[PDB]
Amino acid sequence: NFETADRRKRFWTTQVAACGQSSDDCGDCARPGLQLLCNGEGRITIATDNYVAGLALNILLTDASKADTGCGWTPGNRGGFWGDSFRSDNMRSGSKIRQVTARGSMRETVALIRAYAIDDLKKLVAYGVAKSVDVDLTYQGSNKIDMTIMIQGVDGNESRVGLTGERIANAWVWS
Amino acid sequence: ALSDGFVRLCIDPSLNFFGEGCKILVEGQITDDATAAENVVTCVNSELDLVERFGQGSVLTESLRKVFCMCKSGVSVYALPRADAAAAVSAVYTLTVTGTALTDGRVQLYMGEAEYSLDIGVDEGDTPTQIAAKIVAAISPDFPYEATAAAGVITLTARNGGTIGNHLSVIYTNLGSCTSVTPEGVTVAFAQTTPGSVNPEPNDYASVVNECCFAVYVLSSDDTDWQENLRDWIRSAWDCSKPQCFGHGYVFNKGTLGQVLADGDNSAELSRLALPTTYPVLPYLTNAAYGALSACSTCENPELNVQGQTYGLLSCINMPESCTPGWEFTEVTQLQNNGFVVSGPATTSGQGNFTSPYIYNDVTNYLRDEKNRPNATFRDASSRRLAAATGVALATFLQQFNGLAVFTKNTNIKTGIIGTNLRLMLGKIRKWASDNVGVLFSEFDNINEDIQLVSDFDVQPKCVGQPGVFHLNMRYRPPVRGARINVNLVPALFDN
Amino acid sequence: TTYPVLPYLTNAAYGALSACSTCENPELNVQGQTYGLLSCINMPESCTPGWEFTEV
Amino acid sequence: CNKQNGVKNILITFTHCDTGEVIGPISHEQPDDTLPTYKTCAWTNTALTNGAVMRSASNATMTLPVVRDPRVPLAWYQGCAQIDAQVEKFDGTVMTLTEGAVTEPEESDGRAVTMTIIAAEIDELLPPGSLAA
Numbered sequence: 001n002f003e004t005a006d007r008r009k010r011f012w013t014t015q016v017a018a019c020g021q022s023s024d025d026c027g028d029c030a031r032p033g034l035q036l037l038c039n040g041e042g043r044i045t046i047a048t049d050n051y052v053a054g055l056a057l058n059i060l061l062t063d064a065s066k067a068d069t070g071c072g073w074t075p076g077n078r079g080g081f082w083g084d085s086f087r088s089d090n091m092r093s094g095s096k097i098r099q100v101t102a103r104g105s106m107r108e109t110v111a112l113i114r115a116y117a118i119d120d121l122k123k124l125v126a127y128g129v130a131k132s133v134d135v136d137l138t139y140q141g142s143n144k145i146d147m148t149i150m151i152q153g154v155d156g157n158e159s160r161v162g163l164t165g166e167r168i169a170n171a172w173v174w175s
Numbered sequence: 176a177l178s179d180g181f182v183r184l185c186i187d188p189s190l191n192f193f194g195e196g197c198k199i200l201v202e203g204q205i206t207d208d209a210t211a212a213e214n215v216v217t218c219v220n221s222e223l224d225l226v227e228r229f230g231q232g233s234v235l236t237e238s239l240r241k242v243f244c245m246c247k248s249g250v251s252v253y254a255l256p257r258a259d260a261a262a263a264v265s266a267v268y269t270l271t272v273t274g275t276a277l278t279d280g281r282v283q284l285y286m287g288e289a290e291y292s293l294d295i296g297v298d299e300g301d302t303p304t305q306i307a308a309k310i311v312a313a314i315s316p317d318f319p320y321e322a323t324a325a326a327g328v329i330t331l332t333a334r335n336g337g338t339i340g341n342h343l344s345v346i347y348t349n350l351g352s353c354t355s356v357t358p359e360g361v362t363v364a365f366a367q368t369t370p371g372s373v374n375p376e377p378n379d380y381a382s383v384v385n386e387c388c389f390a391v392y393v394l395s396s397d398d399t400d401w402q403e404n405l406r407d408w409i410r411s412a413w414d415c416s417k418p419q420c421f422g423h424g425y426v427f428n429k430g431t432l433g434q435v436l437a438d439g440d441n442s443a444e445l446s447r448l449a450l451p452t453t454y455p456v457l458p459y460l461t462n463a464a465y466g467a468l469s470a471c472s473t474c475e476n477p478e479l480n481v482q483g484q485t486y487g488l489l490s491c492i493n494m495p496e497s498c499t500p501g502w503e504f505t506e507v508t509q510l511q512n513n514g515f516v517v518s519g520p521a522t523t524s525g526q527g528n529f530t531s532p533y534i535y536n537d538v539t540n541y542l543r544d545e546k547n548r549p550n551a552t553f554r555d556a557s558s559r560r561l562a563a564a565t566g567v568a569l570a571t572f573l574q575q576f577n578g579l580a581v582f583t584k585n586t587n588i589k590t591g592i593i594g595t596n597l598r599l600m601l602g603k604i605r606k607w608a609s610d611n612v613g614v615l616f617s618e619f620d621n622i623n624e625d626i627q628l629v630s631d632f633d634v635q636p637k638c639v640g641q642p643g644v645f646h647l648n649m650r651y652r653p654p655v656r657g658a659r660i661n662v663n664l665v666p667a668l669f670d671n
Numbered sequence: 672t673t674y675p676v677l678p679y680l681t682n683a684a685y686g687a688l689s690a691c692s693t694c695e696n697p698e699l700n701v702q703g704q705t706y707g708l709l710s711c712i713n714m715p716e717s718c719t720p721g722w723e724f725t726e727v
Numbered sequence: 728c729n730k731q732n733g734v735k736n737i738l739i740t741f742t743h744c745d746t747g748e749v750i751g752p753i754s755h756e757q758p759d760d761t762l763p764t765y766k767t768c769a770w771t772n773t774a775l776t777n778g779a780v781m782r783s784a785s786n787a788t789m790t791l792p793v794v795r796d797p798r799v800p801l802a803w804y805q806g807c808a809q810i811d812a813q814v815e816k817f818d819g820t821v822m823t824l825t826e827g828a829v830t831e832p833e834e835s836d837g838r839a840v841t842m843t844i845i846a847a848e849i850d851e852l853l854p855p856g857s858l859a860a
Contacts, residue, residue, distance in 0.1 A: 017189035029186035053191060060185070100182055105745065113183070139747075148193070159490070216718070387718050417724045577703060579751075588736050591796065593751040599738065599813055602821040602852040609850060621860045623853070 006156075008172045012046045013054035032057055051173040052129045052151060059120060064094035095120040110139055121149065128170040197250040198388070199470040201463070203238050203395035204335045204375070205256045206230030212256075216383055219252045229256060232319045232334050238395045238463040240317075244491045245464055246472035255383065257375055263336020264372035268320070268343060270365055271328040276302045276358035283355075284310065285346045287457045289493035289529070291318045297358045307361070319457075338371040339396060342429070344453055346495055348527065374398040380408040391470035392424040395459040399438060402426045402445070409444040421563040423556065425466035428515075429458050432506050436513060443541035443553040449515040451501040455494045461518070464489040465534065469556070477560040478615075478654060480537050484521050487534035496526045507535075514540040514554075561653050565615050572607050573647075576600065581643055583630055600645075601628040608649070617652045625650040673721060676714050684709045729854075731817045734762060737793055742809040752813075755793040758839040763814055764790045765822060767849045789824055789844040795837065804840045805832035812844065819854035 018033035035047035065080035066073060081093045097116045102109055114137045124130045132152045139145060156174035158167065176184050200216070209230035211217060219225075222243055229235045235256055242252060276297050283294040293313040298306060304327045311324035319340065320331035333340025345365050349357050374396065394405055405424055412420040427448040428438045435449050448462055468489065469481045481487050502510070502517060510517050516538060520530045541553040553559060580594035588594050605626060612618055619625055631644035674681075688709065689701040701707045737755040742748070771785035791812060795804060802808075806829040813823050827844035835841075 016187065016191060021189055027186065028188075030189045050191065097185075098181055098183070102182070107746070383718075385718050386720050578700060578706075586735075588738075588754045590754055590756050591798075592754050594754070595738070595752065596736075598815060598819065598821050598852070599736065602813065602823050602850070605852060606823050606825065606850045619860070623857050623860065 006172055010048045010051060010173065013048050013051050014057050015047060015050065015054060016057065032061070050175070052124070052153065052175040055127075055129060056121065056124065056149070056151065059095050059123060060097065062094035063098060064096040064120075065092055066096075066099060089126075091123060091126065107139060110137065110145065113137075117147070117149075124151065125168075128168045129173060129175070131165070131168050192248070192251075194249055195251065197390055197471040197475070198253060199242065199246075199250055199391045199393065199467065200253045200255060200384070200389045201235065201238055201242060201393045201395070202255045203233075203235035203257065203459075204259060204337070204339065205233045205235050206334055209233065209256065211254070213258045214255070214377070214379065214383055216253055216255050216387070219254050229254070230334075232317050234319065234335050234339060234395055234459065237317070237319065237457075238393070238459055241460055241463045241491055242393070242467040242470075245467040245489075246470065249475075250470060250472050253389070257377060259336040260373040260375045262373055264369070265336050266333045266340040266367070266371045267369040268331040268365075268367050269328060270331065270345070270363060272304045272307050273362050273364065274304070274360040276300060276307065276361050278356055278359045280353075280356040280358035281349075282307075282310070282358065282361070283349055285348060285455075285495060286343065287318065288460055291315050297361075300358075302358075333371065336371065337374040338398065339374070339459070341371045342454070342458055343367075344455055346455060348495065374401065376400055376404070378404055380404065381411075384408070386420070388420040389422050391466055392422060393463055393466040393470070394424065394426050395463060397427065397429060397458065406442050406444050413444065419566070421566075423559055425462060425469075427458055427462040429454065432509070435510070435515065439513060439515065439540050441540070441542050443539050443559065445540055446538070446556055447515055447540045449502075449510050449517055453497075453501060455497065456492060461489065461492060461532065464491050465516075465518075469537070474560065477564040478557055480555065480557050480656075482534055482537050484533050487537070488521055489518075489532050489534070492532060493529050494532070496520065496524055496528050496530050498526050511536055511538070514538055514542055555656070558653055561615060565651065568615065572604075583632065597628055597630060597645075601626065604628070604647070608651075613654070615651075615653075617654050619652070675717075676712065681709065681712060684712050729818050732762075733817045734814060735817050736813070736815045737791070738813045739793070740811040741799065741803050742811075743803065744808060750799070752811075753796055753799075755796065757792060758794045759792070761792055763792065765849065767851060769848065786845045787847065787849050789827065789846070789849070790841070791844060792839065792841040795835075795840050801835065801837065801840075804835075804842065805829055810842070810844055819852075821852040823850050823852075 012034060014032055015035050016032045017030045018035045019031045021028050021030050037045045037047055039045070062081075063079045066078055079094070079096075084093050087093075095116075097113065097120060100109065100112055100116065103112065114135060117135050118133075121133050121135065124133055130151050131154060133150065135147060135149045137145075137147055153175040154168060154171050156172065205211065205213075207230070209228065211228045217228075219239060222240065225236050225239060229239070235254060239252070239254065246252075277300045279297065279300060281294060281296045283292070285292050291314070293310065293315070295309060295313045308324055308327065308329050311322040311329055314322050319334050321334060323330045323332070347363050349355065350362075351357065376398070392405060392409070394402060396402070405426070409422055409424055412422050424445045425448070426445055427450060428435050429450045429452070430438075431452055439447060448465060450458055450461070454461075465481075468487075473479065473486065474481060479486070500519070502519070507517050516534060516536060518532045518534045521533045522530050524530055537556045538554055539556050539559065541551075543549050544552065553562075576595070580592065582588055582594050582596050586596045586598075588596070605622065608616070608619075608626060609622065627648045629646050631640040631646065634640065634646060688707070693699060693701060693706065699706065734757060737757070738752040739755060740752045741750045766788045769785060769787055771783045773781040773783065775781055789812070791814070795801060810827045810829065811825050812827065813821065815821050824844060824846045827846040830843050830845060833841070
């Protein structure tokens with residue numbers, strides 16, 4: 001039959017700047033969300049582009065379960081998601097980059113933040129959407145700090161032979 | 176953010192694309208319906224925006240389509256649309272269908288490139304030519320030629336004027352015995368009736384690309400004069416009369432061996448691609464693919480050579496296997512020795528089957544220097560990229576001496592002073608040069624003589640020099656690329 | 672003649688930078704991309720530099 | 728004067744690891760009549776039997792006795808900061824070292840400091856007219 005045999009489809013995906021950017025004296029930042037696409041006669045539809053990038057936003061912008069402390073937390077904000085009780089992959093949803101505390105000089109604290117960021121985004125490889133991820137951080141002074149996150153993708157159809165690693169599963173999103 | 180968070184507040188810009196500094200400029204013609212302004216450089220975003228901005232089936236759109244299909248991400252694209260000459264003529268091709276189909280079957284054609292192929296089924300036996308020639312209703316809109324569907328003959332007219340629309344060789348793959356029964360009694364004849372006349376000759380590069388640095392220039396034309404103007408502009412970017420922008424250009428030349436050789440001139444600023452007279456694929460499509468692949472979509476590393484079946488594979492292009500190699504081996508060697516680039520099929524397969532082309536040698540059209548001596552200093556394209564990289568990197572390293580106190584005459588530096596003298600400056604530079612061996616240079620033949628530092632007072636005569644100006648002279652060598660070994664096989668019947 | 676910024680804004684910014692914020696050690700110059708950057712003035716990018724190198 | 732054995736200029740450039748501060752190439756003076764000593768051969772030999780030798784890794788070492796600058800904390804001169812040094816002898820030889828580290832510091836009264844530095848390699852600039860490349 002026709003070579004387009006892969007029938008797997010793609011659902012909605014959160015996108016950056018979907019709801020515009022919120023400006024303030026400090027700076028300008030994006031406001032991610034869902035995107036609406038309109039036809040010529042109404043009939044709005046949601047966008048389904050940049051799957052892996054949308055997935056990364058979900059991981060970063062979600063608080064994971066907080067560690068036990070001995071004094072306790074209010075039941076409302078213990079963190080995490082109640083739906084994780086059913087997943088069988090032996091992992092927990094969300095992230096915990098926001099649970100850092102000022103320790104030592106600012107240089108040390110920034111270093112810890114990078115360690116958490118790598119630890120949480122590492123889950124992308126486990127799911128199989130991406131084959132490798134790395135984050136580079138640069139400290140320039142008091143108020144200007146930058147982060148860059150690099151995610152490596154793959155084409156939908158195999159083209160190389162003799163790979164040291166393995167062909168990542170769930171690559172039908174081809175990114 | 177508000178009403179959330181504990182310590183910090185992450186913010187990320189809307190732009191999902193990063194990695195600037197890798198810029199590619201594509202130049203070509205357009206059609207009337209294009210809304211883009213002529214002779215104005217504009218940015219290009221993705222394929223969904225094309226067609227409307229550059230016309231339907233225009234030369235520029237086809238070139239851009241391949242560029243985006245080879246550099247999915249990691250490079251920024253730019254377009255410089257042009258307009259047809261005042262009195263440009265449009266080429267016309269004829270394709271006459273004869274006979275009456277008397278058996279069920281299908282007709283399939285291949286023109287220009289695999290993307291434009293069509294396959295339709297003959298309605299039924301006893302369908303004459305008029306009911307045939309339904310091919311016109313099947314030809315894809317993007318094809319640069321317009322089909323009119325006259326009475327029994329279909330006419331193809333170029334959508335762009337000038338000589339650009341003067342290259343075709345159709346392959347009607349199915350005739351004679353075929354499982355998809357060839358409609359018996361149906362035949363097709365191919366012939367040309369009118370060639371192109373006039374090409375544009377823009378010469379305003381200094382005004383529209385005045386002070387923008389570009390990595391790779393791509394030109395979708397075969398006018399020798401137009402290409403010469405691009406070469407002259409590139410020279411100006413490598414000139415020593417002002418800060419340099421650097422860059423490289425890609426062009427193609429088509430014709431017989433005698434014609435192609437005469438088209439070349441000593442030019443390290445261009446990489447001329449040679450094609451034969453019967454190339455099945457449209458010329459400029461292949462040139463765009465080569466430029467886009469080598470437009471830092473892969474050569475972020477300045478020392479990476481775009482050759483071989485692994486790195487020089489133009490996957491985006493599919494063409495049926497030809498009956499003859501086209502470029503005879505005795506001719507392939509001459510083209511390589513003369514500074515041209517030659518491409519050929521990647522995989523050996525029976526004639527008539529589909530393959531992809533790849534590039535043998537990544538070389539520039541350079542054969543001699545200014546003093547008329549022969550050398551291979553700028554033979555490989557990687558040399559040009561490495562030379563630019565060394566210039567930029569070296570300038571950054573020397574930046575640390577800006578505004579630093581310099582002592583001459585009396586060379587003893589008092590205690591607590593922050594300064595340096597000639598000998599200390601030279602020693603520091605030597606350290607940087609040596610450490611880069613294996614990254615930008617090969618081992619120096621004599622590192623003690625290929626670097627020199629002299630103050631301006633020692634060059635100008637008495638009471639003519641300036642305070643705090645130095646002259647640095649350096650000679651280097653790019654990394655080695657290969658070696659030759661002489662082997663003497665010696666069987667020995669005797670022992671000991 | 673084609674400067675895209677109000678002239679008296681650039682003049683004040685340059686004067687203020689080299690007046691107090693920088694020149695408390697007179698030996699220092701105000702040049703380069705680090706010690707002479709008017710970070711409080713923003714103008715759009717353009718291909719044409721305004722001053723040709725010969726004019727500069 | 729070319730046959731005089733002595734030191735002419737000493738330049739050092741600290742880099743505080745804990746805060747990233749960088750101090751320009753300050754000049755220094757030596758405390759007494761001793762001179763620095765150098766070792767620029769990375770590999771080291773050992774004596775086997777019958778003329779053979781074993782070859783080991785070792786490093787490139789330096790020894791720089793210099794008077795402390797009264798505008799720099801004493802800690803920096805010990806193993807709490809990177810060092811980049813250059814020494815220019817009277818004859819013309821210039822020897823440079825980058826990314827060096829101090830090892831096993833000893834107590835100093837406040838003026839005389841004897842640093843022991845180690846780096847991947849040391850580059851030597853012989854006077855004009857060398858023989859080797």
